[PDB]
């Protein structure tokens, strides 16, 4: 539930930023942390930490 909640938060924040209209540094950093969250959900501990 913690991992699912984390992915929900990142996805909602990215949807809010993409309807808002933001610079690419913010948007792509949000995309990167979303991708890392999905990887941490599917197999926690494979890549990175």
């Amino acid at each position: 539930n913690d991992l699912y909640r984390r992915v929900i938060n990142r996805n909602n924040r990215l949807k809010r930023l993409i309807d808002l209209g933001a610079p690419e540094i913010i948007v792509n950093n949000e995309k990167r942390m979303l991708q890392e969250s999905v990887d941490a959900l599917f197999d926690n501990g494979r890549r990175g930490r």
Binding site: N1, Y4, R5, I8, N9, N12
Partner: protein, 49 residues
């Protein structure tokens, strides 16, 4: 026919997911990071529960 799960198996085949198959499986779209209410202990709306 893995819908009503009859008691007559022949083969078990694993494949690969598609987005259309996933949204055909699902019974909604979770969009809030909420689980229970802190006081009434009842599940929330459009959350994980």
């Amino acid at each position: 026919g893995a819908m009503l799960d009859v008691n007559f198996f022949d083969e078990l085949r694993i494949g690969l997911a598609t987005a259309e198959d996933i949204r055909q499986w699902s019974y909604g779209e979770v969009k809030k990071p909420e689980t229970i209410n802190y006081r009434t202990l009842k599940p929330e709306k459009d959350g994980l529960f």
